[PDB]
């Protein structure tokens, strides 16, 4: 019942519209389109996979303005972001140009989608290390000093203590 995307588009008709959703695996599926109040169309998809999905929306075979759109899915209402924990120096303080490292423990949440975002005065390079011990290593490097926000989400819900505010100094 969540409208994964809504589009207000005048003087089209639903029977000539198509909404094709591509999942992260590359699988495509046809989304359900329903017309709400106004000419506001609700596009709904029941996802089998977590992560950002793409939707192409066409009227009479032509992309609408904005297409392709994307949307993210989750959470599922079953737990579970609250069972993930993250910690380490890279969530406390860092230095510009120097890998800021931390771990994420995801084993209690089980299967899903883990998103790591870093926001601030430069673009982060992010590294992921799968470990066979139930934990993930993450590292990021940012070029510019400043306050960064580091977000860790499971199925698009922030885990405990996310977002982390991280002061990044010039190296010393």
């Amino acid at each position: 019942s969540h409208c994964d995307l809504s589009l207000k588009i005048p003087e089209i008709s639903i029977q000539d519209m198509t909404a094709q959703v591509t999942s992260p695996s590359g699988k495509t599926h046809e989304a359900e389109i329903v017309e709400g109040e106004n000419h506001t169309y609700c596009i709904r998809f029941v996802p089998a996979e977590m992560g950002t999905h793409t939707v192409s929306v066409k009227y009479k075979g032509q992309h609408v303005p904005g297409s392709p759109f994307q949307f993210t899915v989750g959470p599922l209402g079953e737990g579970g972001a609250h069972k993930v924990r993250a910690g380490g120096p890279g969530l406390e303080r860092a230095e510009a140009g120097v890998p800021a490292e931390f771990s994420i423990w995801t084993r209690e949440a089980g299967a899903g989608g883990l998103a790591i975002a870093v926001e601030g005065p430069s673009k982060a390079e992010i590294s992921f290390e799968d470990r066979k011990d139930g934990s993930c290593g993450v590292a990021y490097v940012v070029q510019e000093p400043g306050d960064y926000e580091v977000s860790v989400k499971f199925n698009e819900e922030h885990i405990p203590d996310s977002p982390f505010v991280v002061p990044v100094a010039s190296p010393s």
Partner: peptide, 15 residues
């Protein structure tokens, strides 16, 4: 004071 986003997603498998 410019602010940019960088984000990565990981598919987590059943344990």
């Amino acid at each position: 004071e410019k602010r940019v986003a960088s984000s990565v997603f990981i598919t987590l498998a059943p344990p």
